[PDB]
Design a protein around this ligand. Sequence first.
Ligand SMILES: [Zn+2]
Lengths: 164, 49, 102, 75, 99, 283, 371, 52, 138
Amino acid sequence: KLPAGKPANKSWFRHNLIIRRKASYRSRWGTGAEGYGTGVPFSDQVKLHCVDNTNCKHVRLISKATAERFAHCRVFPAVAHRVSVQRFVSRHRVKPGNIYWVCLLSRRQTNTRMSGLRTNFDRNTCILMNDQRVPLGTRVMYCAGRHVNHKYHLKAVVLANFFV
Amino acid sequence: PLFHPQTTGVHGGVPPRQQQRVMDAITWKAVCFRRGLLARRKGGRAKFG
Amino acid sequence: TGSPTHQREYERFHHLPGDVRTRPQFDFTFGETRADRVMFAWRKRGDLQLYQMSGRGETFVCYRCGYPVRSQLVAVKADNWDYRMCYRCYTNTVHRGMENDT
Amino acid sequence: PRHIHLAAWAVQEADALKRVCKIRRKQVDHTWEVVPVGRIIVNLMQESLREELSLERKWAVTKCMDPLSVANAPV
Amino acid sequence: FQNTDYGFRGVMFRHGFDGDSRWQRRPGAMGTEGQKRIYPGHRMAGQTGAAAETYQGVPVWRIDYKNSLIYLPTLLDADVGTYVRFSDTINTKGLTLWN
Amino acid sequence: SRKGMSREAFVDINEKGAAWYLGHMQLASRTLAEKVKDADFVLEIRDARLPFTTGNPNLQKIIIDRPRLIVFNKAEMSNEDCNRVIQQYYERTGNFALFTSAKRSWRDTVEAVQRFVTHILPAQRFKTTANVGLVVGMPNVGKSTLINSLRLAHEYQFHVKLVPVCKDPNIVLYDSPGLTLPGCFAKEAGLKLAACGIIPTNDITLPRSLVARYIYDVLSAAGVGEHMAECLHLPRAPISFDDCISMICERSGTSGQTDLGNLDPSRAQKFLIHDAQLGNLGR
Amino acid sequence: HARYRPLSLRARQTLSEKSDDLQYHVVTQEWFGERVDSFLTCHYPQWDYETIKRLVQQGHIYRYRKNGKKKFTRLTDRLEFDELLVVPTRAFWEKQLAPPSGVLEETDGPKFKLSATAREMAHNMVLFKNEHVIVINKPHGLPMMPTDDPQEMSIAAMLPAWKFTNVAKPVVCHNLDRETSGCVVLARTRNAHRMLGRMFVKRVVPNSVYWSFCVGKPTVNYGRVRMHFDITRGNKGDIIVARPSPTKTSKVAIAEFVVNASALEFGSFISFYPLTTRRHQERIMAAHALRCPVLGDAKYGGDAAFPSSLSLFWDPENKGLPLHLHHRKIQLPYKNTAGEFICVTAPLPTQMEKTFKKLGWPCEVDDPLIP
Amino acid sequence: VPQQLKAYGGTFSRSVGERSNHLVSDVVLQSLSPSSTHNSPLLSKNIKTKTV
Amino acid sequence: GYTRERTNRHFFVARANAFFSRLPIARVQRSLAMEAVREGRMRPWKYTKEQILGAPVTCNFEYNPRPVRLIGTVMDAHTEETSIKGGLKVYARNEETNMMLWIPPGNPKLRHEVTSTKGSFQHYLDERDKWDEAWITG
Ligand SMILES: [Zn+2]
């Protein structure tokens, strides 16, 4: 127990890290199909697809909260999980232990714009990024979202051909 | 303070009345546990099994 | 013997001798409620300073008598709260003149 | 990188009329700087990075938007 | 307006998520004050529902004076037919609404 | 597995219980020298696959006068030519060497120790006394198992750490629990030990991917790709580590996980599917 | 000085009574009612009142009332007629095995000059300061005491730098490793040092924290670690044998670890609250008890503290990576205007700040576990 | 089972006036502490300790 | 009980559902739909689910800098007649992206137009199968 004499919760740091919505009748995480602000950011261990020339193919997230609504106000670190192989350079020299940032390109969950549009992509998509917010892959093999049009994702915008 | 130091070797230095209550409660618990154990060992019923 | 509007808290220990019969130099009641609950502080009688708190009593151990003491009056040495001192030994130290030599 | 930064500043100054914001004054990427000018976007790189990522070749080889192109199997 | 009546609901529904009095920071002494009762402010199961709620400073969006209708770009937690009361907000962000 | 730091590289078993000795062997050098000086002979237990890496450098650097018998376990796993050359080196030196398989290290090592004591070890001034041999070796190699077996035998018979061997010629062995543990080690040494199986692999500190890549690299440098392919039963000789992994997965089955297929080369290396060695020396 | 042996109470009394190096001051008509402290002050101008009180209260100075027994007296007790007062002599303190109180001796030493750049560095290092104590942010690479090489910088060497308007330089209350940075405490005065020394002995209530970045993640988020160390001397370094069970010559090491936030099974952020002081308890417990070495610890997590996982942020081949261990939020007995104790924090060093920023975790955050 | 609450399991000594009430005087000494001296019929009245 | 949660004042307890017939809600909503039609945010539509299912729709979302152009089918339609409370589902399929999206009518920026006068239920079925397979694989 800590502090002795008045024990507190040892989850103080993760409270700052994560964003939690009090599950009350007036406050809940919607299904993402009712309107803007409804949904739920991804947890830590979520596995998602990484689409680019990089050898990596699957990425496990590290951020306690990941969503398109705040893809520009937060950093999404992640670790390559299932890397591909070749049969024969930095893009192809990824390892299943290295840690890079990621840029959301789509969510398999129902995403609602402020315009009333609702979308459901088929794959949770991301791309590897260096600490300087520059993607490791040469190009992309999936469509980004409106959130990826922020200046915080300038190189991602340059590479990604198609948006949604 | 002890109850009767001259008789601590007999009553553990605790009033028998308090000891009486403590042993009543503990014996109730032990009897319940023993009945349960007999039921378990004989097949759910002590007399019958 | 009455409400604070008629009897200030430091006046409760008026039957005892020493600095406690003098009005404390610092009062921390009107402003806020300090975490330690010290409500009055007296003028430093050397490196020792006397404090009074608005609680039932803090059971500390004074390094002069060595006994556990439960009271609202606590004397601290050179602002170090790790070394508390009860009012009896505080008064005796002041009377003997050993304020800076305990 | 200094030449890249100077060229980016010159492009932004040329666009100054309709320009809404300036580029960063601390070059984040010392080998690639992109200035967006409305529908037009300018990418200034070094020779090594330009040869590495052949955006020019990709955008010259990619076929135009054929409406029938969507009439294929999913991927 | 009056909120829609949800009846008697538990803590998970109302107030659902699923200071210090006196304690010693240092090991110097032993003085504490435990909680001897329930304090008046204690989120507990009770009748959640009908209640006079008041949204402040909702912008107006559309006026239809032929049918006598006003459209506010928000959704209320109230039933159809509730007699809502409209007042004019007097200030916002340190300014005055009318100027 | 998941946990990073390997316990076997620090832990041993003393009389009181498990202990975690820390530091490098040079720190203990003095205590080891004193132990050898107060002992009568030395019994060193090492792994034939990487002998000079398993051995304690301080012992060989400080004490050479006292008679010493080295037992290289996993001789069949180790290469024959290296075994013979190092055996000749030790024979030229005043020490003795013995290469042992599983059962040999189990019992023939004790038999050879008894023969050594009877033949070369001088006769004591008395009879009730005992000839003492300081045992030096990494516990995972088999020194700990031998000590535990002797301890159990002595305890059953009855029913500092000295374990008797036989009543005649009254041989006893002193235990050295944490004088030759790996502790912190170089990357190459850690890879060699992990390949030999003496240090369990972890997903963080030293991954199976790196261990198998090192094994493949050393095999390719040796130029034994075709023989490795034949041993693994895969159709054609591989050209890259990834190609070898893919071939292993295909051979194992259609749903062959990359990690599952990468775990197989390490098991094969430990099980002697390929005969090789990792270690240098001087003449 | 040497030639001082540890003496039991009976041995000390026997030596004191046997020794002939005692001076007996008679109490005449003129010094009858004078207090013991005043009498000693008048008769020993060279001595200091600290020495007087120490001798009197520890029994080295006593009085003989012709009663056949030696009375041990307080500083405030009055003298009596025709009674002796027994006081030892320099011969008593030197020419025997009984050690003196650590004040009466006249030992002295030289000084050492400091550069203006060093003084400015020390001033910038200082974090908190009051009339009694200073708390300074000791850097990573700098040592505390002089190293095996005499020609090296040290906090002890720089101590005179922060001798603010005081005749005597402060004294370090506790020491940190050469690789760990963070808060370190200096007592301004000797009395303050004596009073504050009781904080850094083995304790059951933590008062300070250590923020560490550990490779790997422990199986449990919060828990306690206990290891008994048997530090012994070796060839050049020292061997540290750690065991779970106690031993006659072993010393315990206890800590409370809380995983503040773990990225994944690869890296983690831990806070250690130590209840005991030992050579490298935090690093050893993180490396072995938790099986998660600190990110910059090569002495225990050699080749494992430098992981390929953070190759994007830190070069795995750069063995000069500073230790990712940082002393923080030292709680002091002295309170503040708000009535709560003073918890001095130290900003995270450059490497730990960089790692936290890259992982997205905030750096400046209050640790509630240390009030 | 027999008893689950004790204050002092052991037994005290029957002696009251001293530690060795049962022993005869010529086999044991007498405590000279002031507490015993107080009740003592000799050590309480007069005791000379000043010395020439 | 230091606080109260329920109000029994006549103003709040009263309801005008009885008098609601005085104001035609449906006529007002249809007038709003016609205003949207006149403004051009949407065109009138009177189709049944059988008629519309499977019809190709072209979506032009006037985002920036480059408007998003998509071609999809009609998985479902909320209502069978022009109304503000409408909405239409689409299954757009780009090179390697399969996005199923609900688009509401009357939005000036999301210009969605059913490019064909009729749809094929067999096409709807096979497109739905494609979407189901993509979703399962994802
Ligand atoms: Zn006291």
